[PDB]
């Protein structure tokens, strides 16, 4: 084996991230303005815009979930707060009309009670929200939710970064599989634990397990540019979950911060010391202030529309069949 | 598949840019001073110097087109201005002697009228000027022009970045095919849409479709150094179109700008907010002031001549047969 | 041969370092808090924590060896000092309870006398401490020690970076093989001599020779993050030796240094001019002050535990079977 | 073809530079102090130290040639000066004892007269000094010199970067072949002409043509560290020619320059505007002042000796059989 040892499987794959690839232009009769950006969030729920906001306490509370739903996407309410409060945020979103909303739950002691309170509040999507879904506790939670409230509520499981892990969630009954172990902008898992999976390869592998069962993949983490949304969907994801790209917006939690004449907002990992309050796997940082969500989403969707025009993709299902070119460091 | 999924065609190629390769020296009896730099712009038009200036409003108006023609190349007049004015710039270039000149047209409502006004003004080359020529509207425009005014006017189509797209333009009747989707110095398509094609690979692929039909390829975008001109031609292009490298010159539109003691000129993408006035795919920037065009062209051609000496290429047609070595990031 | 010449063996391998790989998550029922971090230092000695401190005069004297043993690892006392003093440091560590301790010896004139004085002082591990163990003098020293004091003392040999070199140490009787030629943070061997071996590949190759004989591999040098510890063990090492990561701690030799408002400690290679006092193969540098050792070890072990959770490794022997993904420069 | 087009030979090789490889340690009974560093400069001339100074007007005049010879290497006197003066510098070196000395000649009108004046002055080595030796004029000059003065004078030809070019020089009668097109620290040929060949691959290819005919290869350009000398020799070169590494020394031409409190000397390409006085292929720069040559050579040879110890190379001929590991950008 060229890289050492005698086991060809020790280094299992070459992992590509978004920056490693570009979408190739293809024959197109699709104008960007006329592309259909709708896509499956879950087996039953289709969004007008294939974007959901991260379940983080510096990204999604009720204000963000309302704005996301109104822009045609969805918010996933974070779970770093009392059950009663999270449930009350779900109610607040429902007070603002017939708006879709999701909410995160863990697999800890209080997770089941949280899930039931969220169901009672009228939540549409429960997101079983872990760093590692390839685990019997997580698979059991997904399965139990699906068997208990699955007729009325769609159940997302995550996160995973391999084909086997995605397959396990599918078998447990997940209505969507969320992909991303280690790629987040505020993530330090790669350096703390040495664990991760570059996101284009992780998506390609998860989709290989999920698409044949009609289960949509949510690409979660590592998206830095609107072009990354198109790349993630072309790799086969059906939606993208965004943290950093939405944390700078007016609708995200937190105050404006002024440093050296420029405006920022705080953005922190849910595994940072601050969020957990220990061996943290995220940092506390800041992102540039970006203005209203509606405006940010317009630009992100605009980039996606451009990609759909270049690739001749009339729908997201067509974009999922687009081809890449791999690029070098020089590119 | 080592990079993920089970489809070997999902990642279709490894795309190389100029910085990824060097020309290998070869047996040579060619002195740089004696190399013949002439090359086909189109099937019928041969230039003394294989360089044309970009159809951009911070690169080519009448002054630049005149200087380019006099230096042995050609200018392509930009189309971000009224039809009457563009036509009047064509006339101005013709007032300055028997000088070749080209002009850009789109495929919009006013494009046909623009094309006819340019023909009436005496234009030599019409450049159907789009970001994505692999499209029925663009192919139809090329074909219609070629069938209508093709006896007197050469018709260039672009831009493309794949073999299939180049083949389509050839079949539509293009007299030259322009290659470059995403490589421009002021381009943000790669980050906004996630779309692009590294230029050495794009040229190699376009040439595979164009050379067998005797259709010249114009390498457009991404050329940063005189050495890149030689690389582009060696990959099989017949001419290079330059934006950034010519925008700093006296003959380009725009005033001198002084910042921190150094001289610059503005250089902006035609897809920047400023040029379009929205989801822009270019930036507004600045380039160092470079002095007279004649001097810049002398240096660029000097570098090309050096390459022809090292590779033993007496003509551009010989240079098109030269070989590369691929280099690493360290190189 | 694509890279030149006609000999496929001239460039023998593609060498990967820690930064080139990530651990892939796998099915897991292992909680990080419940993982067993114990591992073989040598054939007979098992540590609670798979970490030993470098035999360097800015990393390990008696204070560090005591703290390392108490944290569940071990210190290797440096040998840049008189025999009587090194022996006295061994005694000092033994005065502090039933604590494991190692000590370095060379292969020079005084090395045997040093080894015997260390044995008399009660040392548990002798580390034959060289930059290049693939040498008859080094192999002879290992063998002689093992045949003379091997019933009571475990004998480590190093350093190596190839399968053949590791095999030679195994045959000489080593109780552990230490791997690392050129990877240290303060090392300049790569630039001075042009010699080295990227550490993931070096570990994979050494383990291929050592594991079949039940000889543990100590990964020595180049570990910059807690995640690198997990990577090294997953590549098949049984323990990691740390210099830079422990040199910033309270228990390391040397005073606090204040530069530009921040706190540092000096950290220097044993092949630096200063340490040898000439063609040095190390630098004299500084590392950020890190606080108490106990705290640093907690964080390092915390990262390892996280990796064990993600990979489903209940023990270090299980972690040694984990798989990698290779990543690109972009990642 | 993965990188584009249908011709597998268009991109002929993957070119490695020094930074792309490391020497692998091997079984060794060689102490660095006892290695034999002697090596063939030409078929007949063996140096004690395998180093020659570049024929550049900021590196080698009589003072440098004397110091190089005394250190066991050789200087090549530059030719950017009148014939009478260059000849007088050769005489000056001969006045200082039985010291070896070389001198550069071109292939221009005055080159033959220069060569004869140098022969009359007692030169030992004539270096036919060009940027591209794969040329009938250069091959003819080499052949004519060898047939005319070859009994008393060794004739070096260069530069080349391919197997074919090296083969041509061998057939012309060269006593050594100098390798390096584009790698020099002050070289801009790579960006001006787009031409070059990474030096490890260039050496491997040249050696494939030269070693079977018993013709030594001189590695010229791109050596930045003492470790690069060992790499070049291991790739099969017999000596290394140094510009940048020797330009900072007391014995090089030029005055000390003080900028921002630090000491430098000027170092310029022979293809820079300044040296030629136009399309330059070198820059005018500065290098840190390094002190006496004797000291610099001691450190360079010290690094080489270290490499010989690590690789078990008792002689340079043994070092030429050493193996590499290829490293990644991360390494
Ligand atoms: C505190 C939580 C959440 N984060 S996080 O906030 O940083 C985080 C949140 C969401 C997605 C993430 C995607 N990649 C990295 C971290 C992500 C990391 C640590 N953590 C775990 O649950 N770790 C863990 C890991 C493996 C296990 C296990 C527990 O028990 C069985 O096997
Ligand atoms: C405003 C124009 C021109 N630019 S530009 O100014 O930035 C630009 C100009 C010239 C060459 C370019 C080479 N690469 C990138 C951009 C380039 C980009 C956006 N644009 C389009 O026409 N986009 C578009 C794309 C695909 C389509 C489609 C329209 O309809 C069918 O399929
Ligand atoms: C002074 C000592 C120790 N260092 S060090 O302090 O920089 C050093 C110490 C420990 C581990 C190291 C891992 N890689 C690099 C250097 C390391 C380097 C120089 N050195 C040698 O012994 N060199 C040497 C090399 C090869 C030989 C040989 C001697 O005789 C036969 O073959
Ligand atoms: C002025 C001289 C010397 N230099 S230099 O000073 O920059 C230079 C000097 C020495 C080694 C060099 C190694 N690589 C690059 C440049 C090097 C470059 C330009 N030059 C040439 O002779 N160029 C040339 C090239 C190819 C030809 C040809 C002439 O006629 C036939 O084919
Ligand atoms: O602390 C953390 N460490 C690692 N990943 C996190 C953490 N907090 C949230 N995440 C994940 O990172 C995603 C956001 O990534 P981003 O959009 O690149 O910033 C989130 O949706 C989570 O999946
Ligand atoms: O706004 C833009 N975005 C992307 N490409 C552009 C834009 N404007 C012009 N171009 C193309 O970029 C080329 C100039 O590239 P440059 O020489 O690298 O600066 C032009 O000839 C166009 O093909
Ligand atoms: O001067 C030196 N040059 C090269 N390697 C050294 C030197 N001194 C110590 N080492 C080795 O570098 C290891 C420390 O590496 P680090 O943890 O990356 O700083 C040590 O355990 C030694 O194996
Ligand atoms: O102007 C120049 N351009 C390119 N190569 C040069 C020039 N002048 C000298 N050289 C070559 O560069 C070598 C020095 O390279 P260096 O040791 O990397 O600085 C010289 O021995 C020449 O072969």
CSV table of C-alpha atoms and ligand atoms in Angstrom, one decimal, chain C residues 54 56 159 178 183-189 220-223 241-244 267 269-272 281-282, ligand 7:
chain,number,residue,atom,x,y,z
C,54,UNK,CA,9.8,13.4,25.8
C,56,UNK,CA,14.3,16.6,26.6
C,159,UNK,CA,14.0,6.2,16.7
C,178,UNK,CA,9.9,4.4,19.1
C,183,UNK,CA,8.7,15.0,12.6
C,184,UNK,CA,9.3,17.0,15.8
C,185,UNK,CA,8.0,20.5,16.2
C,186,UNK,CA,11.5,21.8,16.9
C,187,UNK,CA,13.2,19.6,14.3
C,188,UNK,CA,15.2,20.9,11.4
C,189,UNK,CA,16.5,17.5,10.1
C,220,UNK,CA,7.3,10.2,18.9
C,221,UNK,CA,7.2,13.7,17.5
C,222,UNK,CA,4.9,15.8,15.4
C,223,UNK,CA,1.8,15.6,17.6
C,241,UNK,CA,5.5,10.7,23.3
C,242,UNK,CA,4.9,14.4,23.6
C,243,UNK,CA,7.4,17.3,23.7
C,244,UNK,CA,5.8,20.5,22.5
C,267,UNK,CA,11.3,24.7,24.3
C,269,UNK,CA,15.5,20.6,20.5
C,270,UNK,CA,18.2,18.3,22.0
C,271,UNK,CA,20.0,18.9,18.7
C,272,UNK,CA,19.9,22.7,19.0
C,281,UNK,CA,19.2,19.6,13.7
C,282,UNK,CA,16.9,21.5,16.1
E,7,LIG,O1,16.8,18.8,18.2
E,7,LIG,C1,16.0,18.0,17.8
E,7,LIG,N1,15.8,17.8,16.4
E,7,LIG,C2,14.9,16.8,15.9
E,7,LIG,N2,14.1,16.0,16.8
E,7,LIG,C3,14.2,16.2,18.2
E,7,LIG,C4,15.1,17.2,18.7
E,7,LIG,N3,15.0,17.1,20.1
E,7,LIG,C5,14.1,16.1,20.4
E,7,LIG,N4,13.6,15.6,19.2
E,7,LIG,C6,12.6,14.6,19.0
E,7,LIG,O2,11.3,15.5,18.9
E,7,LIG,C7,10.3,14.8,19.8
E,7,LIG,C8,9.3,16.0,20.3
E,7,LIG,O3,8.5,16.4,19.2
E,7,LIG,P1,7.3,17.3,19.4
E,7,LIG,O4,6.4,16.7,20.4
E,7,LIG,O5,6.7,17.5,18.1
E,7,LIG,O6,7.9,18.7,19.9
E,7,LIG,C9,11.1,14.3,20.8
E,7,LIG,O7,10.5,13.3,21.6
E,7,LIG,C10,12.4,13.8,20.0
E,7,LIG,O8,12.1,12.5,19.4
